[PDB]
Amino acid sequence: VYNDGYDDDNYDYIVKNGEKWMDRYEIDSLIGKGSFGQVVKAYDRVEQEWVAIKIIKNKKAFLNQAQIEVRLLELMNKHDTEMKYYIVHLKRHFMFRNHLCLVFEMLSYNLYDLLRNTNFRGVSLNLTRKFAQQMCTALLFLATPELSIIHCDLKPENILLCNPKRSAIKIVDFGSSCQLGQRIYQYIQSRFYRSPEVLLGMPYDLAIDMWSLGCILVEMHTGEPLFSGANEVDQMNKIVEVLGIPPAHILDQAPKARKFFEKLPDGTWNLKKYKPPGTRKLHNILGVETGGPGGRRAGESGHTVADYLKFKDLILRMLDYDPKTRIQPYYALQHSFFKK
Numbered sequence: 001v002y003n004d005g006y007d008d009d010n011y012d013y014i015v016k017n018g019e020k021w022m023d024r025y026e027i028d029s030l031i032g033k034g035s036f037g038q039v040v041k042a043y044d045r046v047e048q049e050w051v052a053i054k055i056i057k058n059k060k061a062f063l064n065q066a067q068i069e070v071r072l073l074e075l076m077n078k079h080d081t082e083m084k085y086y087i088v089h090l091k092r093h094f095m096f097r098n099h100l101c102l103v104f105e106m107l108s109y110n111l112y113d114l115l116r117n118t119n120f121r122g123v124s125l126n127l128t129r130k131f132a133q134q135m136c137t138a139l140l141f142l143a144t145p146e147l148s149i150i151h152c153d154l155k156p157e158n159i160l161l162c163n164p165k166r167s168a169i170k171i172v173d174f175g176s177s178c179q180l181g182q183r184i185y186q187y188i189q190s191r192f193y194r195s196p197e198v199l200l201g202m203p204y205d206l207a208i209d210m211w212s213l214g215c216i217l218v219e220m221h222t223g224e225p226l227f228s229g230a231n232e233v234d235q236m237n238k239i240v241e242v243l244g245i246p247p248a249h250i251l252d253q254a255p256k257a258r259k260f261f262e263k264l265p266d267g268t269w270n271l272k273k274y275k276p277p278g279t280r281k282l283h284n285i286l287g288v289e290t291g292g293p294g295g296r297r298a299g300e301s302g303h304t305v306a307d308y309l310k311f312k313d314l315i316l317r318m319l320d321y322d323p324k325t326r327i328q329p330y331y332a333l334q335h336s337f338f339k340k
């Protein structure tokens with residue numbers, strides 16, 4: 001017996017279809033799950049609308065992660081009452097049968113689900129552009145000084161459609177997030193989307209989320225992760241294949257430089273004992289001059305050489321090794337990849 005019969009051996013609440021809570025919510029069905037717990041579709045009888053209830057595991061580490069999340073969501077939502085900046089809306093929260101419960105607006109499929117639905121062949125450049133514009137607008141809002149929030153776990157699965165037939169999105173899952181100058185974490189970001197400064201053990205700021213965004217946008221159009229490392233050494237080597245050896249001024253100050261690199265007599269750095277550095281060109285991953293990914297966009301509208309050159313230019317600015325010169329949200333939104 002766990003939690004008087006209400007919980008399973010994984011710390012999760014055992015969902016019961018049609019259960020009534022608090023003279024208010026009628027639980028319908030499970031609609032998603034993850035490390036944190038479960039998400040159910042429920043009818044809110046007071047507000048007369050469907051909601052998504054995120055039921056956190058009954059275990060102190062998961063409870064405290066979600067308490068951090070609640071505080072950040074309350075801060076963000078207070079500064080976007082019109083819901084124009086692409087962050088999910090937390091309506092309220094409560095404790096129920098020893099589980100913290102977060103009540104959200106209901107959302108639809110995530111962007112990994114969309115990739116699966118393309119048979120892992122990618123969405124169009126036009127749809128990629130729509131997702132990119134909304135994500136850059138969200139990053140601009142997170143960078144406002146009263147927020148200064150670093151999401152720290154951006155990936156396709158954490159970006160959700162509002163409605164199944166439309167391109168509008170919201171970002172979810174602030175459990176691993178932090179604020180500039182209240183930064184605590186040395187180990188952060190899911191591996192495929194992890195920035196060079198984090199891999200190298202260096203100081204970090206909101207620019208880590210822009211790195212993740214550049215990786216995400218390439219994957220949305222090709223269908224496959226850009227840098228699919230199996231461990232940190234493989235991750236760094238995959239980044240180097242595309243982007244070359246990082247600048248010496250960075251490696252000279254990196255606590256973990258020698259996990260990946262060695263310094264030569266002339267002061268230059270090379271890899272420790274892959275395609276040679278910088279020879280896996282993004283120009284060819286995207287298929288700029290050869291019909292897009294797999295050549296499959298040849299003959300389609302919305303996929304010109306000129307369009308692809310603008311996309312490539314913006315991505316390479318998001319993937320700058322130097323976090324001080326990497327493109328920032330304000331300037332990303334002004335880039336000619338985006339439309340008047």
Ligand SMILES: CN(c1nccc(-c2cnn3ncccc23)n1)C1CC1
Nearest residue numbers: 031032039052104105106107172173
């Ligand atoms: C339709 N769904 C949904 N709808 C609204 C809000 C959220 C949500 C809010 N915060 N988080 N955090 C992690 C994972 C999901 C969510 N999920 C997803 C299936 C679960």
